[PDB]
Ligand binder design. Sequence first.
Ligand code: CL
Ligand code: CL
Ligand code: ZN
Ligand code: ZN
Lengths: 21, 21, 21, 21, 21, 21, 30, 30, 30, 30, 30, 30
Amino acid sequence: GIVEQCCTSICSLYQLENYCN
Amino acid sequence: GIVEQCCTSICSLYQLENYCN
Amino acid sequence: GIVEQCCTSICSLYQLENYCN
Amino acid sequence: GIVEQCCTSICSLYQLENYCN
Amino acid sequence: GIVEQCCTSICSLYQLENYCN
Amino acid sequence: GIVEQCCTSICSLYQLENYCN
Amino acid sequence: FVNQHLCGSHLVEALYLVCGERGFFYTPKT
Amino acid sequence: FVNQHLCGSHLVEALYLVCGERGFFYTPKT
Amino acid sequence: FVNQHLCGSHLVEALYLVCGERGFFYTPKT
Amino acid sequence: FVNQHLCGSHLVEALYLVCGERGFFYTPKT
Amino acid sequence: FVNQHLCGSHLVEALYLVCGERGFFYTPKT
Amino acid sequence: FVNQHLCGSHLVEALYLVCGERGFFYTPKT
Ligand SMILES: [Cl-]
Ligand SMILES: [Cl-]
Ligand SMILES: [Zn+2]
Ligand SMILES: [Zn+2]
């Protein structure tokens, strides 16, 4: 999920957009 | 400038990006 | 909604708790 | 103290109320 | 007090330092 | 740089003033 | 606990603290 | 832009920035 | 609610949230 | 250092930075 | 991404997220 | 005052506090 993608690994601002409504 | 524009009105992430080194 | 109520007036932690998954 | 209870270990919002005036 | 002064007007870091333990 | 001085090591608020314009 | 006055990012911080590992949904008007 | 580690309240602050009015979900359990 | 690790500025932000008008003390030396 | 305009949680963050390991007390009016 | 309304420290946080390891310069008027 | 570890967004928040109107640069590459 988001934690694995962005905290544990590393993610872009674009990938963060995956979690918008 | 950017600091004032973001606060008194609105600004975009793309505008912000201009202030990266 | 909650986002507006907390800002324009006040809200409680118990109200917030309603927005947990 | 608070650091041992809430940072080093893990504490609830209720336990945090222990440190209010 | 300090909490109100910093917000309604301005305050200095040296004023803040008075509230350290 | 700033990261080595203040994150990796430890720095004072005075040393942080080194990075003001 | 005490009543809260929370705008912008301050609301998201409060949600984070309140909900913990449960997570939460942030759903503003319009 | 860039890629960085974003954890905890920092993650939800980043979601707020990027999503804003759209809103978002923070569901760490996944 | 939940239980989580709260450290440094995150801890004092949590104290602010929970205590608010009452005020609080942050005394890490203990 | 420069003069500060600090409201809400922003004041608690400033106290945290200023006082460090000494900690501090946050005591609003009423 | 969405348009932003950012004051004080909130602008510096946004710069931090946007610029990452590149860093940035914060240059207010007057 | 004190000396503490200041990293990431916490570092840039500290720079904002100390520099304010002067402005500042955050150049982690160095
Ligand atoms: Cl604010
Ligand atoms: Cl951290
Ligand atoms: Zn704020
Ligand atoms: Zn942090």
